[PDB]
């Protein structure tokens, strides 16, 4: 009969840095064996120091980015200041698990900086269990994502290697090539890709063409 | 003849929340002083009997590691409000993982002060002092029975408010030490409690930027009367 | 006097008392002025205190990114109702996805307000809001009261010695469409310094200043950023 | 996933692994599965991660509430207590929690263990997890209550060694602490490919 | 005394004066006049102009219920928009589960039934507000109903609300408004609001006119601009 | 459901339901209470017997656990609900953390329900005040009493009831160190006390004393007997 | 709407309260019932009010009604109230049977009863009960008991009170002719019509003027007996006789 | 709604130079039965917005009293204030969401075209509570079929002449006569401009059938 | 089956001036036995009977239900019920239970308490009484009790013909049964006394 969910894909990836944090999406929206759009990101600006990326339901997705920016505005009015990264994450534990017996089918991975001025990634499941992390990728191609980064930013499973931190500029052109493999071998991952990055003085986009498929 | 509870006068104000204004000139007095260094906050006791056992009564209690309180007018309704305050800081504690500033403790507490009426009885009639130290420094806030809190520098609350009040204004800079100003306030309870100053009329607590809030005993207490 | 008790006994005159005794409250809190331009509402408070220790008790909230209010009366009514301004505004923020319009989040609040005006046992809203904000049409700025009967007005003023700084707006008031943000504010600032005793005016701790505007968010001035605005004002004239 | 706790002469050991699949895909490999509550109580993940997390989060605002109102601590009997009063309201709805609570009190040390159906039990050995079994068998063998504490943290970080080679759903790091009479202290977190090496030769 | 206190007491001769206390509120707010044409009705209001500071299209008393309902009051402002929303949902739910637009001899017996239901209890007041209905369908023709706050409706050909009712309404009678069409009406509805309140007790004062037919379609809205300067224009007439 | 604020304020900042009700405490018969350092002793006087009537259901020293006694003074309708609700809260605190309720803990029980009481709609405040009795876990003595605003206060020695100023008086010139001395010793301080009150010549008086890991143990009129002989053959030579 | 209000639950100023003192006035006047124990046996002497010379004297009594298998009550004060709280323990007496499949004891229902009766004193605005009423029975904790019951909401045990219009005349006669735990029940009835022979002012104590009642232990019955109007007049007589014998030789 | 009576079928909307065309048939189907083939399926919201719906018909005459009372309602007050097309877009899916969470759906599939303030709007709203934007959109089988016409269009040609796309969706109109079931030779057109909102007559197609002589 | 988790058996039949009721003993779980002095009939006022067969909760839980609101009904009124009162008043706690139902099946069996005259009915689970003249049964053996009943009743009997009839009905048909023995208990109840007798049957 009726069910009410459906899986509209979408691929997300975020990198804490050293003083930055890129958190990247596709554009396409699609479901069945059809294509909705071409032109749907998933970069969401929540303030100038905290973008959320949200894949899965794109139902659940749209609710749930409202209900956490109703939220923040909330916060301000009872405490005259913005939230931290720290403190949406926090919430938005409580939020997803707020609804325990009748989920959201969304995979959440908030970026931004600390109170330092560091990179912080906090990766969600549907539930609302976390842990900050140097890097995660979550959606369709999250299998195909993470092993990568394990080799090149994790510098795992190597011999005789230097352990340089990763630089903004090396940071760029790994996210560019990562999603070029993956949208080889992913029937989901898109056609221009949404790159964010926050830094310290606000936040730049680009966006970056794929095969369109 | 019989008004009901929720009822303007002729000049406007109310009854009886300016009623429980006078009631808080009955309770024992109490004087915070916030300093850069950290806030100190003391009270009187007001021993009636040689029989009564004096530690089992309390006007300084702690809300939470960082907020201190300091009641005044009536107790037993004063254990309420105190009680909310502390599940009010664990609810924002749980669900944003930080601690709640020292204003916003107050005015959840301030929102539950004029909330009686006739559906869902009679406003509270106790006055506060909220002593805390968040991220914007120490802080010393002073609610009312009406819901109305202010922050203050040096507020002086109980039945001696007004002397004590006129006694600090001229004792008190912006540049004071937490040394001092305890030696300060003791100076001031000195001179408008009844019986004679020692260890066990009187009780202080202070809460500083490094450590958390810290209640002095009968120890460490008395070298600062004997010192006075 | 019997039918001075409660707000259901209508007076034999057919003035109910309980609501203009909600009229007196509102003429004890210190005065708040506002006005508007062709492409911006300003609006002006005057802050008091207890003792020269105690801080400031401040008037002007932010509601949304295009209404602020100004505040007078007791301060605990003010805040049930702010809390219920905030609701109304992200809700139809979470609906429309629009932001909720000035003269129709008013209709809202006589509505809410005319309760508690004619059921049994229930005070009135003893508080005095000034309402500036946004629509697509330009500036408002809006007046209400504990009778719950709002206002479209150009130019008011409410609170305690008010009636002199409403003389001063009616001879002044052919100007205020005409000029930019610089001497819109002090046109206003002459106005609270019109309601004070004649000795002390404007020493920048007991003054604040609301701005809402054409490219502009709603912003809230205090007490150092007043600076700029509160020089080059000439002296009181006697 | 593969927890284990035991309690001899000097305090509580605990011990957990820190991998967390998805069917069977690994998630993540660096999941603090012993959880904080207090300076002075901990608890463990096993079954479902988010509710874990979250009942035991609920635990540690509850008895901050208890502290205020009696000017002590709690016991760890009272703790566990209400851990097992909250979880059965939802009996059957389909909540997967398998923790333990450990501490030191007033009695002494103290390790309960806690179901989502409604467990409540003492004991000195603990073992919960999809790769438990493997944990008890060089448990059993190894265990004196008389242990040395440089023994008995050998005893605990080889013992999660053998269920990590065994089980597929278990691995990642050994972490480790020990409950001592003031507080808990975090001792350590060695990596399994680094035990590999030492305990081989 | 005593008898007054409640609307839930009866004197001792048997009339309810809180209602009667209630009505005494409606001759302090100003003038609402309203009479209907051969083919429409049209509403008119004086209002006056409290001080400068406020703006020309404040507070109107004059609204709009549904799309061919109007509405005119006269009483204390708060209780007046409170019954204009009820009204105005009232017809909502007629169109909800009828399907079509409300009959006037319906919508007023709907409000004025809720407006007598606060004359019976000790909990609520009276309200202290008179209004005036009015519309016009093509199967009906135009109606014309007024409400006081007893809880009273009747049909009139042309009625008046306000402080000066009964010399208001004697110039009504002196027209003929069972021929003439609502475009002659809008000059003479104009004029004999200026006969009355004089210069003494008000400074200046504010028209405000209203309109419904089938030459505005039905629909209710108000007079364009330009018209209602011709009866501005048709203003200082009445001086010979 | 009848809503009407009962309790209200005065003009000069007072309750008067409240200060009203003290009085019905103040006509109620006098209760004493002191605490020695291993044996708590607390007994009532103006048993005001009628030779008629079943002695035990006239008690007023009744047990809420093991390790706690109560007495009280007021109206006896009131008091009776009190310790129902009483023991049912201190009987869920051993569901709850495993051990026994401290003496401490049930005042703060009573007393929390006995103010939001004076603040409800529709209900007239109580009328009883209460001495709270108990040895605690590690063995230490201590006792309370509940105003009928709801303040818990602990003591050395207190007396409430008719003629209860007078009592008060009596114990400052009398507590000493040496009084609890003995067990047998501090029971002749409130021998003394209460034949210093209303008449009560051993046939009105019902001492019940707790050795700090027995129940309650009332004393039949024998020893009260015994005790008042000797009580009054100190004052019969030393005078 | 708070004008007609009459507050029936506030205190006075002197600290007692008004509207329980004036039922206990109302408890004073109309009616007379007493009881009396000391051995195997329990009984009620009751004086009938109405003795107007057309009614049917029907319903097995007047005062005096069975509460459970072995314990019944007497009652005073207005009649109507008594009606409502009598089958309101009657049913107390069942839902204990229902959860514990054992009869009550005879304490524990006077105070469920007196519970119910003191939450009328203390909220809900709302006029007393002006009923008190006594209570005898047999369980196997203390055998046969006898309680009182005022309308304030407290109760006690005894062994000898009346609440009659003079009933201050009759306990102090009660406790000038009585003995601890040897009035047997015939000494007992005997006693009996010697009190209301004082109390009530309407002479030579017509037989219909009273009723008694009586509950006496067999084995497994716990018979509760209302002894009939043949055996009352042969015990008023007795009565008689011995008054003559005993002024004469004195 | 758990099962559909009375259904719809595809409808088509694209944006051109300062306006948006929608077109859909004038057939309530009942299974594989074309019981109502004369109703009409397209409504026209007050001055700048419009709406047409697939699936459910008695569901979509149900929002069709709705939202017909939230503009009567709102244009009685006199603000000078109207709903945007993307204001009601933003309520409709609110309106889904809202309501597949309590496990009882709208069985609709919804196309809000609209121009107001210079600019073309053009949204899908899902039974689901599915939105988003784009300039060209279809529902039911003209996703699979007409949907691949418009976008090699657009990806061509990115913006259009009124007379352009009112041509090209005549043609994705014969096309869902042919290879669709549940189809009727019996259409509308409504279109919103700058001017206002205008919706033709029962329009017809001509089609072909000059292969049916190859044996 | 739900009826047959524990077994039972109850048997009514009407005689001259008499009326006699018997039952099983058996206390047990579907395969085994637990007790052999279950009890299964109910005292309800005097020369007036009540057996209960089905489920053993609602053996016990309605035969306290039922004298629940039977000390009720005898105190608010002044004298004993009726037989004929009974079985509507049982009818009425079944039928309460519409959707919920007890699973029991009760048997009423005494005598009219003014003129002396026998009564016996039966009910379903949810209250549908029968009033017969002759016998009722009820249980997991009803099959084998109509055997008997229709070929050794007779319709004038005395007390003495009338033990020997329902006792050979009752141990013919229960020993054919699986789930019911242990035991029979046999009451027999008339004007002047009360007899009750334990039979000798199969413990088998």
Redesign the interface.
């Given at each position: 009969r009726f069910s009410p969910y459906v899986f509209n894909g979408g691929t997300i990836l975020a990198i804490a840095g050293e003083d930055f944090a890129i958190v990247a999406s596709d554009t396409r929206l699609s479901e069945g064996f059809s294509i909705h759009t071409r032109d749907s990101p998933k970069c969401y600006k929540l303030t100038d120091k905290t973008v959320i990326g949200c894949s899965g339901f794109h139902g659940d997705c749209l609710t749930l980015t409202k209900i956490i920016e109703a939220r923040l505005k909330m916060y301000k009015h009872s405490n005259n200041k913005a939230m931290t990264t720290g403190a949406i994450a926090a919430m938005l534990s409580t939020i997803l698990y707020s609804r325990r017996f009748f989920p959201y089918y969304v995979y959440n991975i908030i970026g931004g900086l600390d109170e330092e001025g560091k990179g912080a990634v906090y990766s969600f499941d549907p539930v609302g269990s976390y842990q900050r992390d140097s890097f995660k990728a979550g959606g369709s191609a999250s299998a195909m994502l993470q092993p990568l980064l394990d080799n090149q930013v994790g510098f795992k499973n190597m011999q005789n290697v230097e352990h340089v931190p990763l630089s903004l500029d090396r940071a760029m052109r790994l996210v560019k090539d990562v999603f070029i493999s993956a949208a080889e071998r992913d029937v989901y991952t898109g056609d221009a890709l949404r790159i964010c990055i926050v830094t310290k003085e606000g936040i730049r986009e680009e966006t970056v063409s794929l095969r369109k498929d | 003849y019989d008004r009901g509870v929720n009822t303007f006068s002729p000049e406007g104000r109310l009854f009886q929340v300016e009623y429980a204004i006078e009631a808080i000139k009955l309770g024992s007095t109490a004087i915070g002083i916030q300093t850069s260094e950290g806030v100190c906050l003391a009270v009187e006791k007001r021993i009636t009997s040689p029989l009564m056992e004096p530690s089992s009564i309390e006007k300084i209690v702690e809300i939470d590691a960082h907020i201190g309180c300091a009641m005044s007018g009536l107790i037993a309704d004063a254990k309420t409000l105190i009680d909310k305050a502390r599940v009010e800081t664990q609810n924002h504690w749980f669900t944003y993982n930080e601690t709640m500033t020292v204003e916003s403790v107050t005015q959840a507490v301030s929102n539950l002060a004029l909330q009686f009426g006739e559906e869902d009885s009679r406003p509270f009639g106790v006055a506060l002092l909220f002593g805390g130290v968040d991220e914007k420094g120490p802080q010393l806030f002073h609610m009312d029975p009406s819901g109305t809190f202010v922050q203050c520098d040096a507020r002086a609350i109980g039945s001696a408010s007004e002397g004590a009040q006129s006694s600090l204004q001229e004792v008190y800079h912006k540049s004071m030490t937490l040394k001092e100003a305890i030696k300060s306030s003791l100076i001031i309870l000195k001179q408008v409690m009844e019986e004679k100053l020692n260890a066990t009329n009187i009780e202080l607590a202070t809460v500083q930027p490094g450590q958390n809030f810290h209640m002095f005993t009968k120890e460490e207490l008395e070298e600062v009367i004997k010192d006075i | 006097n019997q039918y001075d008790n409660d707000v259901t006994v209508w007076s034999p005159q057919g003035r109910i008392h309980q609501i203009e005794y909600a009229m007196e409250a509102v003429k004890q809190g210190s005065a708040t002025v506002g006005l508007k331009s062709k492409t911006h509402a300003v609006l002006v408070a005057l802050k008091r205190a207890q003792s020269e220790l105690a801080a400031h008790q401040k008037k002007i909230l932010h509601v949304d990114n295009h209404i602020g209010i100004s505040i007078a009366g007791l301060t605990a009514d003010a805040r049930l109702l702010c809390n219920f301004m905030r609701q109304e505004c992200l809700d139809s923020r979470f609906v429309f996805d629009r932001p909720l319009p000035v003269s129709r989040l008013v209709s809202l609040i006589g509505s809410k307000t005319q309760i508690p005006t004619q059921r049994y046992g229930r005070r009135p809203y003893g508080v005095g809001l000034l309402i500036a904000g946004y629509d697509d049409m330009g500036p408002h700025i809006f007046q209400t009261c504990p009778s719950a009967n709002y206002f479209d007005c150009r130019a008011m003023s409410i609170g305690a010695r008010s009636q002199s700084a409403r003389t001063y707006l009616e001879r002044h008031m052919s100007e205020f469409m005409e000029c930019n943000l610089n001497e819109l504010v002090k046109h206003g600032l002459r106005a609270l310094r019109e309601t004070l005793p004649a000795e002390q005016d404007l020493t920048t701790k007991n003054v604040s200043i609301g701005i809402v505007g054409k490219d502009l968010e709603f912003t809230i001035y205090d007490d150092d950023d007043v600076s700029p605005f509160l020089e080059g004002l000439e002296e009181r004239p006697q | 996933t593969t927890t284990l706790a035991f309690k001899f002469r000097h305090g509580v050991i605990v011990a957990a692994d820190s991998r967390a699949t998805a069917g069977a895909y690994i998630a993540s490999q660096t999941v603090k599965k012993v959880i904080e509550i207090n300076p002075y109580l901990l608890g463990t993940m096993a079954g479902g991660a988010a509710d874990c997390s979250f009942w035991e989060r609920l635990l540690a605002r509850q008895c901050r509430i208890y502290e205020l109102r009696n000017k002590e601590r709690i016991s760890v009997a009272a703790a566990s207590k209400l851990l097992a009063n909250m979880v059965y309201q939802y009996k059957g709805m389909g909540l997967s929690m398998g923790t333990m609570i450990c501490g030191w009190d007033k009695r002494g040390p103290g390790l309960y263990y806690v179901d989502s159906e409604g467990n409540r039990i003492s004991g000195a050995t603990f073992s919960v997890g999809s790769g438990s079994v493997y944990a008890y068998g060089v448990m059993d063998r190894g265990y004196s209550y008389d242990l040395e504490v440089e023994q008995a943290y050998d005893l605990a970080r080889r013992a999660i060694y053998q269920a990590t080679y065994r089980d597929a759903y278990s691995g990642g790091a050994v972490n480790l602490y020990h409950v001592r009479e003031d507080g808990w202290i975090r001792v350590s977190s060695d990596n399994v490919a680094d035990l590999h090496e030492k305990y081989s030769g | 005394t005593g008898y007054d206190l409640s609307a839930s007491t009866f004197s001792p001769d048997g009339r309810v004066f809180q209602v009667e206390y209630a009505m005494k509120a409606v001759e302090n707010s100003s003038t609402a006049i309203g009479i209907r044409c051969k083919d429409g009705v049209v509403f008119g209001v004086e209002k006056l102009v409290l001080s400068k500071l406020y703006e020309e299209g404040s507070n109107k008393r004059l609204f709009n219920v549904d799309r061919h309902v109007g509405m005119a009051v006269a009483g204390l402002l708060a209780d007046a928009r409170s019954l204009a929303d009820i009204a105005r949902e009232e017809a909502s739910n007629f169109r909800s589960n009828f399907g079509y637009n409300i009959p006037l001899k319906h919508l007023a017996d709907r409000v004025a039934m809720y407006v007598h239901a606060y004359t019976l209890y000790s909990a609520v007041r009276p309200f202290g507000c008179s209004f005036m209905l009015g519309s016009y369908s093509v199967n009906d023709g135009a109606q014309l109903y007024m409400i006081d706050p007893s809880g009273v409706s009747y049909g009139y050909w042309g009625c008046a609300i306000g402080k000066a009712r009964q010399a208001a309404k004697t110039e009504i009678e002196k027209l003929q408004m069972k021929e003439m069409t609502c475009r002659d009406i809008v000059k003479e509805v104009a004029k004999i609001i200026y006969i009355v309140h004089d210069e003494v007790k008000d400074k200046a004062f504010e028209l405000e006119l209203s309109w419904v037919g089938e030459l505005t379609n039905g629909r209710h809205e108000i007079v364009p601009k330009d018209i209602r300067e011709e009866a501005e224009k048709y203003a200082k007439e009445s001086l010979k | 459901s009848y809503d009407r604020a009962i309790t209200v304020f005065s003009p000069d900042g007072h309750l008067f339901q409240v200060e009203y009700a003290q009085e019905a405490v103040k006509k109620g018969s006098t209760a004493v209470g002191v605490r020695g350092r291993d044996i708590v002793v607390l007994g009532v006087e103006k048993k005001s017997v009628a030779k008629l009537q079943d002695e035990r259901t006239v008690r007023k020293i009744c047990a809420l656990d093991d390790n706690v006694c109560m007495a009280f003074a007021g109206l006896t309708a009131d008091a009776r609900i009190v310790i129902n609700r009483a023991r049912v809260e201190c009987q869920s605190h051993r569901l709850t953390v495993e051990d026994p309720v401290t003496v401490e803990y049930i005042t703060r029980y009573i007393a929390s329900l006995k103010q939001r009481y004076t603040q409800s709609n529709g209900r007239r405040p109580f009328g009883i005040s209460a001495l709270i009795v108990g040895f605690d876990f590690d063995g230490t003595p201590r006792l309370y009493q509940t105003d009928p605003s709801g303040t818990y206060h602990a003591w050395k020695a207190n007396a409430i009831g008719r003629g209860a100023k007078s009592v008060r008086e009596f114990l400052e010139k009398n507590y000493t160190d040496e009084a609890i001395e003995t067990d047998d010793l501090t029971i002749k301080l409130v021998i003394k006390a209460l034949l210093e009150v209303v008449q009560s010549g051993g046939k009105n008086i019902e001492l019940a004393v707790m050795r700090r890991d027995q129940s309650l143990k009332i004393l039949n009129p024998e020893e009260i007997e015994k005790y008042v002989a000797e009580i009054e053959k100190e004052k019969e030579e030393n005078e | 709407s708070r004008r007609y209000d009459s507050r029936t639950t506030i205190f006075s100023p002197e600290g007692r309260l008004y509207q329980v003192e004036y039922a206990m006035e109302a408890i004073g006047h109309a009616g007379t019932c007493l009881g009396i124990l000391a051995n195997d046996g329990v009984l009620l002497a009751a004086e009938r009010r109405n003795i107007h010379k057309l009614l049917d004297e029907v319903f097995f009594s007047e005062k005096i009604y069975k509460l459970n298998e072995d314990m019944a009550c007497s009652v005073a004060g207005i009649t109507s109230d008594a009606n409502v709280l009598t089958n309101e323990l009657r049913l107390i007496a069942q839902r204990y049977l229902l959860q514990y499949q054992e009869p009550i004891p005879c304490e524990q229902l006077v105070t469920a009863l007196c519970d119910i009766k003191q939450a009328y004193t203390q909220f809900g605005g709302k006029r007393p009960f002006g009923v008190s009423l006594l209570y005898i029975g047999w369980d196997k904790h203390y055998g046969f008991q006898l309680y009182q019951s005022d309308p304030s909401g407290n109760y006690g045990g005894w062994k000898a009170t009346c609440i009659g219009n003079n009933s201050a005349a009759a306990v102090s006669m009660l406790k000038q002719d009585y003995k601890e735990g040897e009035m047997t029940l015939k000494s007992a009835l005997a006693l009996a019509i010697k009190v209301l022979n004082k109390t009530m002012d309407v002479s030579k104590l017509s037989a219909e003027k009273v009723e008694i009642a009586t509950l006496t232990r067999e084995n497994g019955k716990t018979v509760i007996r209302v002894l009939k109007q043949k055996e009352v007049e042969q015990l008023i007589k007795k009565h008689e006789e011995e008054e003559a014998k005993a002024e004469r030789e004195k | 709604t758990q099962n559909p009576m009375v259904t719809g079928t595809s409808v088509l909307g694209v944006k051109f130079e300062g306006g948006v065309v929608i077109a859909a048939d004038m057939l309530g189907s009942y299974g594989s039965l074309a019981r109502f083939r004369n109703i009409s399926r397209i409504m026209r919201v007050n001055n700048s917005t419009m709406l047409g719906a697939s699936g459910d018909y008695a569901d979509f005459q149900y929002l069709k009293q709705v939202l017909g009372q939230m503009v009567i309602d709102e244009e009685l007050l006199g603000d000078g204030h109207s709903y945007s097309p993307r204001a009601i877009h933003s309520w409709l899916t609110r309106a889904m969401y809202s309501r597949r969470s309590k496990m009882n759906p709208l069985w609709n599939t919804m196309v809000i075209g609209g121009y107001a303030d210079g600019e073309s709007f053009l949204g899908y709203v899902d039974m689901l509570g599915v939105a988003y934007e784009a300039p060209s959109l279809a529902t039911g089988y003209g996703a699979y079929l007409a949907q691949p016409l418009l976008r090699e269009v657009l990806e061509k040609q990115p913006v259009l002449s009124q007379t352009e796309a009112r041509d090209l969706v005549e043609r994705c109109m014969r096309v869902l006569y042919y290879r669709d079931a549940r189809s009727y030779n019996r259409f509308q057109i409504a279109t919103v401009t700058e001017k206002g909102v205008e919706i033709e007559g029962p329009l017809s197609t001509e089609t072909n059938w000059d292969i049916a002589h190859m044996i | 089956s739900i009826m047959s988790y524990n077994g039972g058996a109850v048997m009514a039949m009407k005689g001259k001036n008499c009326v006699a009721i018997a039952a099983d003993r058996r206390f047990g779980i579907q395969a085994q036995m637990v007790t052999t002095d279950f009890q299964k009939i109910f005292p309800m006022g005097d020369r007036l009977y009540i057996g209960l067969a089905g489920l053993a909760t609602d053996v016990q839980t309605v035969a306290?239900?039922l004298?629940?609101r039977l000390?009720?009904y005898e105190?608010?009124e002044?004298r004993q019920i009726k037989p004929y009162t009974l079985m509507s008043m049982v009818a009425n706690l079944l039928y309460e239970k519409r959707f919920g139902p007890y699973y029991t099946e009760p048997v009423i069996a005494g005598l009219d308490p003014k003129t002396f005259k026998p009564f016996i009915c039966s009910l379903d689970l949810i209250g549908c009484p029968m009033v017969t003249d002759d016998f009722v049964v009820s249980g997991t053996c009803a099959e084998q009790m109509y055997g008997m009943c229709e070929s050794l009743w007779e319709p004038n009997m005395d007390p003495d013909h009338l033990f020997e009839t329902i006792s050979q009905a009752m141990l013919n048909a229960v020993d054919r049964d699986a789930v019911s023995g242990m035991g029979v208990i046999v009451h027999i109840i008339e004007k002047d006394k009360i007899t009750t007798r334990t039979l000798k049957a199969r413990m088998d």
């Open positions: - | - | - | - | - | - | - | - | 306290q239900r004298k629940f000390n009720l105190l608010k002044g």
